Design an enzyme around this catalytic site. Structure first.
Site, PDB file in Angstrom:
ATOM      1  CB  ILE B  80       2.200   7.219   7.728  1.00  0.00           C
ATOM      2  CG1 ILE B  80       0.980   7.275   6.773  1.00  0.00           C
ATOM      3  CG2 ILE B  80       1.782   8.331   8.958  1.00  0.00           C
ATOM      4  CD1 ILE B  80      -0.115   6.581   7.259  1.00  0.00           C
ATOM      5  CB  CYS B  81       6.394   4.911   5.146  1.00  0.00           C
ATOM      6  SG  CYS B  81       6.867   3.624   3.900  1.00  0.00           S
TER       7      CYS B  81
END
Lengths: 145, 143
Positions: B80-81
């Site tokens: 994820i970011c």
């Protein structure tokens, strides 16, 4: 979008200690209210803050100072100025004006002589701590009540 | 440093949750319930949480262990970011608020800046296929 955030912050503050109002119809100028924490010389006090919200909030932190006179090593006894890590290098847009107010309220519960905004208050707290507490309680009864 | 993590862990346990994985208090398993009214409804998602040496100044690293179909999470790896875990990290935030933010991201996917191009393409061009798929993966991996 900037206004939508600030309005929802205000709403959540009310829906939830601490509170806030806008000033003069400007959502970039607020007044903060903080209750003195229980078991401190500030207990029973009601402290008003001035809150200037900068144009690039939330990337830039709000500026806050006490309007109510308060005797605390980390608040200027003369001008109400404070230096909170969360309004400085620990600020993030993920935080809120509320978390700043709560953090100021926690600072009232944990005075730090070591790193002070008021030299004279810090001096007294070292030399004569029970006098510091007596002063803080009398200032609370006098100015915050 | 230990006292901060032990306190955060207690508070979390007292929506979202976490637990230590084995005996390393810098390694947690995170748990997030899929939000209501989304394709992730009914799902329980497990995350891997690596808390670095210098926490709270350095953010946790988090990724989905559970497979999930979401434009902002890799379908392949669970990467994820999240802004809160990057330039919006602050020591004044907590692991719980990062979990809460990831949960929010589940309730509001952003195909226009994606982590999975294949998933964002589907969400954009074939939204009902996206919802159908995201729900099938909730059913398959998260229930």
């Amino acid at each position: 979008r900037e206004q939508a955030r600030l309005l929802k912050e205000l709403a959540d503050i009310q829906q939830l200690g601490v509170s806030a109002q806008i000033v003069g119809g400007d959502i970039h100028r607020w007044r903060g209210f903080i209750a003195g924490p229980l078991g401190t010389p500030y207990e029973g006090g009601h402290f008003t803050l001035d809150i200037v919200i900068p144009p690039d909030y939330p990337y830039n932190p709000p500026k806050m100072k006490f309007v109510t006179k308060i005797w605390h090593p980390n608040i200027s006894s003369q001008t109400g100025a404070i230096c909170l890590d969360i309004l400085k290098h620990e600020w993030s847009p993920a935080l809120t004006i509320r978390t700043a107010l709560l953090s100021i309220q926690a600072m009232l519960a944990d005075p730090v002589p070591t790193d002070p905004q008021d030299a004279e208050v810090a001096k007294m707290m070292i030399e004569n701590h029970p006098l510091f507490v007596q002063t803080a309680k009398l200032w609370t009864e006098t100015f915050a009540k």
